[PDB]
């Protein structure tokens, strides 16, 4: 069984508590398939939505088409979320739990280090989001580093980001992703 | 003479008007200094905006003194003036009030062209609040 | 067939594995002088440039205008930017021509004319220049205090030991947002238990590091970002004069702060307009003079990564570094970031600095080991505090870091670690037991720290920010545990935002809490018989590392 992305038209805001939004970059199952370290897209968004699930609440996926910026992306997750909480992930890996109400460059989580994350550490991303959503202080993902990430994958995180940002739409609302599996 | 510290520093004064002197660990202890004295006054602002002029860094001199202007107004209402300078959060309209603000509250006449030419800037290239 | 070995054994080395690429100008992906780049110019009419680096105020950016009307000096600029650049190189490596000499000039021209004298020098002219245009006269060093678990114990502690080896500023940061305070506290502590004296930072998101500083957590802020293109500079979240303005926020309140930039910012976030990395750099630095910040922290710093990938990269990285000190600002020249699995690569990027010396050599040497540096790593780290020592030895060059016996860090590893316990429990926050204290006393790496309850942790952050702490309380929670010491020196440090005297360029301050910087030690180097020359006391501990024996 694999996970496909579906467009959708346009996401609105919701008030609906029991949700988590997870807005992927422009290119996100798309014009991009593959993180820095080639992992499917489908099976890391299928990792995250049963992260929510598992904890009881419903996960929406939506593409932020505004802008490549994971924490803007995360933001929009966001102030999307009728819990108030999203998340946010760029083609090439990089992701966030962010809050509706904090600031912008400011989150809740982070995952800084893409080629480290794993399917497992996207699916406990998942249920922290989902916890985070029912108003709990679930203990965040331990976060994981490697000082050699940079010197291997920096120049070609640049390089993925400037196929992923040739894809953002200025101004434009974000669209809503149906899931087929 | 620089440093202003050690020349002189019984007229180093906190905005309260407590002298640097004051400034003890028994007085803090004994709950008479505050978190609102352990501050900058904008004699001292003056001060160092001089003493780098007098280095050719003008530049800096000007930042100080645009600082000075700042002492005044409370902690969170610099954060709101910050936030509202960043990227889409105002219209002009509310950029202009604040410039508004600045000068007949606050006095702070440089801080308030500063962001009269920011709402310029931010309206010619497009960076105030998404619409309406 | 059959493959040589020779090849083989070449291709499993470490250095191959560092991501090198061809340059791509249309994206920026490529150091300098890129086809993309302007042509230096300049026009002034009725006190206004009307015209910068080949366009006319018409079309100026948020960035451009902003340099036209802040970061040059109009009334010089014409004539300035009649000289060649090449004649301004000549100039910088001149040792009949002085510091004040080529400031008068160098802040009248613009960021393309910079640029373009930068491509006129090779490193060892750089590093002459730089050895004359730093503003500080004696060099200094910034180092990384941080740790996967965000662990407070092992923070307070590593910052002692990081200030008896010689560290004039300490940075960290955190692996989870909301762990900061703590952070900033146990940094705070531990600072001044190993040097009084030593300012510090916490990097985090610009409105809540202003916040802390403003609650006295810590002495002063570098990671206020600029950026070279308008699209970067808005995912920045940031435009030059909110930037500007919170530049006056941090001083209207007596805190020392600088900017920080580097090269390959704007191409690693996807808008360079096509120019190359130092371009965009240069006009970073025109932003930091302009907005009337004393210091930058610039030289590829976290993206090192990208700079390094292209031709002359390294080049570059110094070239950036000389063009902000020419320009008369403090400098804290990176050297903070991992980009090579080589030891000969990394080391020849930071002779680049070390060996001229700048206002802070490194602006953020690992004092931990780099699994434990939560900036994703540093171009040095603690297991190469012997080395960094024998070097200075062997060069006769001051990197500004000294030996220490295990005796006098286990001992100042111990009294920080206690005294941080100390504090929390004054505080009443979650107690740090005495197996705590132990580990991080003797231990290397978070490796060796008993984990903690995270939740706990952040739920009594939450409930200290409410409580609205003050740095002044932690003087308080010092006094009454024993440690007056340590209080009174935090206190003295807060005391510095009454003075203001650590506001101007370079500043930074020894152990009597005086301030020691570019207008009360400027560098006046002249070619030899002047400038900066290491002190015979200075000599002799750089000399006198523990292990040398004495022949006979
Ligand atoms: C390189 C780097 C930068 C670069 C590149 C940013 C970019 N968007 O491309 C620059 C200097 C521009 C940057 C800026 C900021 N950074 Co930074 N950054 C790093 C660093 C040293 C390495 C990351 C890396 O190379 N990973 C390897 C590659 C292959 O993985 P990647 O998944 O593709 O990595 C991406 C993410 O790390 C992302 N990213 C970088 N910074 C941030 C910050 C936030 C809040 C988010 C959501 C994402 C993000 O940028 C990389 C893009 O290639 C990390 C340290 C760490 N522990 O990871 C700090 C770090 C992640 N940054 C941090 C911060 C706070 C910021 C700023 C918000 C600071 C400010 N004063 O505004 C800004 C703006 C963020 C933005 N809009 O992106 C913090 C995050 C703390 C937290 N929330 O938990 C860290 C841990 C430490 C620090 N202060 O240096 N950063
Ligand atoms: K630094």
């Known amino acids: ?181 | 003479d620089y440093p202003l510290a050690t020349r002189c520093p019984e007229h180093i004064l906190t905005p309260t008007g407590k002298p640097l002197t004051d400034i003890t660990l028994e007085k803090v202890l004994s709950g008479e200094v505050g978190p609102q004295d352990v501050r900058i006054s904008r004699q001292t602002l003056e001060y160092q905006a001089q003493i780098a002029e007098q280095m050719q860094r003008h530049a800096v001199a000007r930042n100080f003194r645009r600082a000075a202007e700042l002492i005044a107004i409370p902690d969170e209402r610099i954060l709101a003036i910050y936030n509202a300078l960043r990227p889409f959060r105002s219209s002009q309209a509310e950029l202009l009030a604040i410039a508004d603000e600045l000068e007949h509250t606050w006095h702070a006449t440089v801080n308030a062209a500063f962001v009269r030419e920011s709402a310029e800037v931010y309206q010619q290239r497009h960076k105030l609040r998404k619409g309406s | 067939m059959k493959r040589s070995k020779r090849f083989a054994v070449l291709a499993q080395r470490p250095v191959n594995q560092d991501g090198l690429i061809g340059e791509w100008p249309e994206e920026g992906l490529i150091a300098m002088d890129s086809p993309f780049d302007p042509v230096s110019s300049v026009k002034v009419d009725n006190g206004l440039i009307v015209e910068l680096d080949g366009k006319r105020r018409d079309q100026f950016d948020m960035i451009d205008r902003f340099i036209a009307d802040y970061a040059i000096n109009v009334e010089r600029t014409e004539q300035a930017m009649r000289l060649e650049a090449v004649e301004i190189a000549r100039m910088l490596v001149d040792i009949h021509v002085s510091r004040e000499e080529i400031i008068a000039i160098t802040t009248a021209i613009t960021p393309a004319k910079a640029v373009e004298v930068m491509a006129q020098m090779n490193v060892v002219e750089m590093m002459m220049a730089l050895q004359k245009m730093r503003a500080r006269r004696t060099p200094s060093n910034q180092c990384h205090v941080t740790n996967l678990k965000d662990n407070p114990v092992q923070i307070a502690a590593d910052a002692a030991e990081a200030g008896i080896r010689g560290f004039s500023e300490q940075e960290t940061t955190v692996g989870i947002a909301r762990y900061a305070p703590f952070n900033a506290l146990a940094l705070l502590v531990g600072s001044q238990c190993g040097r009084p004296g030593v300012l510090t930072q916490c990097s985090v998101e610009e409105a809540t590091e202003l916040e802390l500083g403003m609650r006295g957590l810590t002495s002063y802020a570098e990671t206020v970002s600029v950026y070279g293109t308008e699209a970067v500079f808005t995912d920045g979240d940031d435009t030059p004069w909110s930037k500007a303005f919170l530049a006056s926020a941090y001083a209207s309140r007596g805190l020392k702060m600088r900017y920080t930039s580097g090269t390959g910012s704007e191409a690693l976030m996807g808008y360079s307009e096509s120019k190359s990395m130092l371009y965009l750099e240069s006009r970073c630095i025109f932003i930091t003079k302009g907005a009337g910040v004393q210091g930058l922290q610039n030289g590829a710093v976290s993206c090192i990564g990208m700079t390094g990938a292209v031709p002359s990269g390294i080049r570059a990285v110094l070239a950036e570094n000389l063009i902000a000190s020419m320009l008369d600002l403090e400098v804290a020249s990176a050297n903070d970031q991992t980009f090579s699995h080589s030891d000969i690569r990394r080391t020849a990027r930071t002779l680049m600095q070390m060996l001229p010396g700048t206002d802070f050599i490194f602006s953020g040497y690992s004092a931990v080991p780099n699994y434990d540096n939560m900036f994703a790593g540093s171009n040095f780290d603690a297991e190469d505090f012997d080395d960094y020592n024998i070097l200075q030895r062997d060069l006769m060059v001051d990197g500004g870091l000294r030996p220490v016996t295990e005796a006098e860090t286990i001992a100042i590893r111990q009294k920080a670690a206690r005294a941080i316990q100390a504090v929390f429990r004054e505080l009443g926050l979650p107690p740090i037991a005495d197996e705590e204290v132990e580990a991080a006393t003797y231990a290397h790496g978070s490796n060796e720290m008993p984990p903690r309850n995270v939740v706990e942790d952040l739920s009594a952050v939450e409930e200290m920010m409410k409580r609205n702490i003050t740095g002044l309380d932690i003087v308080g929670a010092l006094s009454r545990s024993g440690f007056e010491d340590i209080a009174s020196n935090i206190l003295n440090m807060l005391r510095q935002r009454v003075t203001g005297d650590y506001l101007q360029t370079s500043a930074i301050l020894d152990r009597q809490f005086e301030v020691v910087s570019a207008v009360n030690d400027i560098n006046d180097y002249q070619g030899p018989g002047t400038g900066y020359r290491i002190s015979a006391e200075r000599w002799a501990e750089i000399k006198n590392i523990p292990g040398v024996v004495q022949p006979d």
Do not use: C
Request: negative net charge; charged residues 25%.
């Open chain 1, 1 to 181: 069984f694999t996970l496909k992305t579906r467009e959708g038209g346009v996401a609105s805001a919701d008030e609906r508590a029991d949700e988590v939004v997870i807005g992927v970059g422009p290119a996100f199952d798309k014009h991009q398939h593959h993180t820095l370290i080639d992992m499917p897209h489908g099976a890391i968004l299928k990792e995250l939505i049963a992260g929510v699930e598992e904890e009881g609440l419903h996960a929406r996926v939506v593409r932020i088409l505004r802008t490549s910026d994971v924490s803007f992306m995360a933001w929009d997750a966001a102030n999307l979320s009728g819990s108030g909480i999203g998340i946010g992930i760029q083609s090439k890996g990089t992701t966030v739990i962010h809050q509706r109400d904090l600031l912008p460059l400011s989150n809740l989580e982070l995952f800084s280090q893409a080629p480290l994350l794993t399917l497992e550490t996207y699916r406990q991303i998942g249920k922290n989001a989902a916890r985070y959503a029912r108003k709990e202080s679930p203990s965040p993902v331990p976060v994981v580093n490697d000082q050699m990430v940079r010197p291997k994958f920096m120049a070609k995180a640049a390089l993925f980001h400037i196929k992923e940002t040739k894809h953002v739409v200025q101004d434009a609302e974000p669209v809503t992703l149906h899931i087929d599996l």
